[PDB]
Amino acid sequence: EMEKEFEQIDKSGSWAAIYQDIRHEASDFPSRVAKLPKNKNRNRYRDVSPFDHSRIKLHQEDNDYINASLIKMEEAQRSYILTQGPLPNTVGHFWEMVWEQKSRGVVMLNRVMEKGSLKCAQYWPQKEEKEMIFEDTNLKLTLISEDIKSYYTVRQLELENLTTQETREILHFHYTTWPDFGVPESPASFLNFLFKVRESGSLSPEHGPVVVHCSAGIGRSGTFCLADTCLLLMDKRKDPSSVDIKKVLLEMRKFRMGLIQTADQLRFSYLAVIEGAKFIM
Numbered sequence: 001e002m003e004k005e006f007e008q009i010d011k012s013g014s015w016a017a018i019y020q021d022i023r024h025e026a027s028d029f030p031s032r033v034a035k036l037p038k039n040k041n042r043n044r045y046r047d048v049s050p051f052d053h054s055r056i057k058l059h060q061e062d063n064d065y066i067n068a069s070l071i072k073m074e075e076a077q078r079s080y081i082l083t084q085g086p087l088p089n090t091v092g093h094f095w096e097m098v099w100e101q102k103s104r105g106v107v108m109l110n111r112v113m114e115k116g117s118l119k120c121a122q123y124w125p126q127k128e129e130k131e132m133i134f135e136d137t138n139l140k141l142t143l144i145s146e147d148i149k150s151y152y153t154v155r156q157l158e159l160e161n162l163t164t165q166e167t168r169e170i171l172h173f174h175y176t177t178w179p180d181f182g183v184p185e186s187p188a189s190f191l192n193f194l195f196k197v198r199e200s201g202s203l204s205p206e207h208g209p210v211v212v213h214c215s216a217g218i219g220r221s222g223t224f225c226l227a228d229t230c231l232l233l234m235d236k237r238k239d240p241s242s243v244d245i246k247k248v249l250l251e252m253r254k255f256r257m258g259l260i261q262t263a264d265q266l267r268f269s270y271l272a273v274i275e276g277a278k279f280i281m
């Protein structure tokens with residue numbers, strides 16, 4: 001059981017050691033499309049790239065590239081798209097991908113500004129009456145409603161395909177209280193946030209994969225997906241304690257590099273799963 005393994009690593013203070021072994025054991029696959037010169041300005045960080053095998057392709061004939069990865073968890077019957085914070089230039093591309101993958105939810109784990117820098121373009125409208133048009137990708141985005149709470153905000157958006165006049169409701173789940181440095185003290189509000197996303201049906205197989213992003217789409221994003229998947233496998237399996245979070249993390253890392261950036265995020269993920277297991281059992 002992971003609870004006892006938690007105390008072990010914690011009492012021994014071995015988090016940097018565990019984390020380093022995971023770094024060592026992680027998959028490395030080609031990312032040739034990410035590195036093409038024509039895609040240089042479609043990437044926020046030069047050392048964060050989608051693998052070619054799991055990358056999301058845009059259905060535009062010109063350049064199909066976006067910094068985004070499909071993570072398929074076969075046993076848990078869960079899929080996620082992990083992507084970077086859109087850039088000023090890639091906001092049209094981001095919404096094109098939401099449209100093409102038939103996603104119902106966007107999950108954002110960063111503020112637009114953190115540490116006095118921009119982590120992310122402002123990619124949704126701030127007022128009902130000021131909708132956004134993406135001329136490059138022929139989409140229109142309207143804020144329908146906005147429910148602001150202590151730890152997070154939920155926004156209903158309408159996405160319209162200007163080409164075909166089809167519309168879809170997209171839910172934007174925005175966790176607004178992740179601290180600028182380190183990880184939250186308690187996983188309580190993060191679990192609450194995870195339960196709210198699940199309840200929306202955005203993680204459900206009747207929809208395309210949820211889109212999850214922070215700035216790089218690997219650190220906080222990773223914690224989101226790792227916690228969701230581990231909790232789901234604890235429901236599914238005959239023996240819930242068969243679930244090894246290190247194994248699950250290594251299976252997710254086949255799909256996107258660098259998921260969980262720090263030993264702190266690793267520890268927080270254990271704590272999120274351990275605490276969420278109580279509510280589930």
Ligand SMILES: c1csc(-c2ncc[nH]2)c1
Binds near residue numbers: 043044089
């Ligand atoms: C941060 C990293 S790259 C970037 C950017 N790309 C295009 C405009 N601003 C902002």
